[PDB]
Symmetry: C10
Subunit: 74 residues, 10 copies
């Protein structure tokens, strides 16, 4: 079981790499929001919900990386 356990811990570490995708993706969404609102303040109420949807969909990819990570750890 030593080899299998060792692999579980290597695997769990590898599985967090994909979180960099959500880290960057979430930022890209919020950057667009800020820039869109700065150029056209009246559009705020329209684009804010688009940013939330964007965030959630990008975040979901990171969430699944973590799930695989924790399946391997536990």
């Amino acid at each position: 079981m030593q080899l299998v356990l060792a692999a579980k811990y290597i695997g769990a570490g590898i599985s967090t790499i994909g979180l960099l995708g959500a880290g960057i993706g979430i930022a890209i969404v919020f950057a667009a929001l800020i820039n869109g609102v700065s150029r056209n303040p009246s559009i705020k109420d329209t684009v804010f919900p688009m940013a939330i949807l964007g965030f959630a969909l990008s975040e979901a990819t990171g969430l699944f990386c973590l799930m695989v990570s924790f399946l391997l750890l536990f």
Copy 2:
């Protein structure tokens, strides 16, 4: 059999890396949506279905990374 199970676990972890691609890609689509609607609010109903299509096609790449992951885990 210990060596094969080890491989399945390390493999599962490696297969989540590609999810960074959906994480970022989905955000890129939403950033475009926000910036297009801020510059031209009247175009919202035209470009929103394009953003949904674009999201879904980028997300499918992540979905299949995750299929490979789950196939290795289980």
Copy 3:
């Protein structure tokens, strides 16, 4: 036998990494579509088929990563 099986499962995981390219590339195409349409709405019927060709060619790289992956798993 056991070592070869181990290699195929690691190989399968690695072969999905390339899917990040399609995930990002499909997004870049759709981002251009949305931005082009927002700036010039009358061009929609011209650039939409271009985005579809773009998506298809970028997707092909992803498909062939996944092909190698399934040849390794099975």
Copy 4:
């Protein structure tokens, strides 16, 4: 146990790689804040809180990487 311990410490080092995403993401949010304010100073009080929220959400992806890292080091 020599192999399991070895894996815990390799795994912990690997689990920090994900932090590059928050280091880059946080910067992207702050760049946008700066560029938006320079172009439209009167929007500062509106966008500053959006930038704090964006930072917070981007940061959380980094925090989870480090949690996994700490679990492998100390658990």
Copy 5:
């Protein structure tokens, strides 16, 4: 024999990583096509063959990643 076969299969998987360059590069070319046509519709017949040349050349890099992959898988 067992170790060589193992390495061929690891090698083949690694050789697909390079395909991400074609996946992204083809997109970049098509993004420029779409943006240039949107800004100047009258130029489309001129830039369309440039986009086909660009896609083809970027794709060729991915084609050779694949050739190495198949040589390791089927050689």
Copy 6:
């Protein structure tokens, strides 16, 4: 003992990879600062403290990559 020490040193080297995020992110913040001040010099006193906040937060991600590195090296 030998294998665990080996892994601590490999782990410590891997844990520095994440620092590239801070290296790039800090730059992105300063690039926005410079570009926003060039386009609107009157805003500089407003955006300068935003740039310091942004740099600090991006840097914190790299600081924790380093902490893991030092924990493996000196723990």
Copy 7:
């Protein structure tokens, strides 16, 4: 020799990763060509040869990766 052969084939797969640079680089040159021509059509005969030279030089970095790959596979 089982170990040496294994290494030749792993090495060959790794040596294709560099090809992503040419796949992306070639695209970047062609994107610029397209965008420059769309913005200034009369410049086409001037920039088209610059784009061919840029592609050629970018491609050469890909060609050398594949050479190393072929040496490890066939030499």
Copy 8:
């Protein structure tokens, strides 16, 4: 002893990877400097010190990668 020495030399090589961040980041700062000065030459004396602070902070990440590297080699 031999395995530990082997690890320190692999570890040393890996620890330089992070230097790509400074290599790119220092460049991004200088690119902004050159672009800002070209667009507004009268701002040079204001933004030059900002670029130097920028360079220094980005360089610090690189320096500490190299510190880990030299601690491993020696």
Copy 9:
């Protein structure tokens, strides 16, 4: 000598990764040239030598990756 030779071949493969830097960097220089000339054709004779210098300095990094590669192979 089997282990050392195996390492020479792994090492030589790893050493080509850095070539992606020159592949992309050279392109970035030529993209700027093309865009600069398109915006201001009269500047061609001025910026062409800057592009050549840029190319050569970016290429030098790729050249050294290859040197290390061939030292290891031979």
Copy 10:
């Protein structure tokens, strides 16, 4: 001793990866130079020394990756 030499060779290869950072960074500086001079030709004598400084500082990161490489090789 075979294991240590193996490590030196693999390590040497790994240490050239960071050179991609100079490859790209140097190009980014030169791209800015070209684009700044195209937009404002009169600024050439001001920004050219900034591009040289920027090149040299980005290149130094690559230079030290290469020092680590050569130290491992020899």
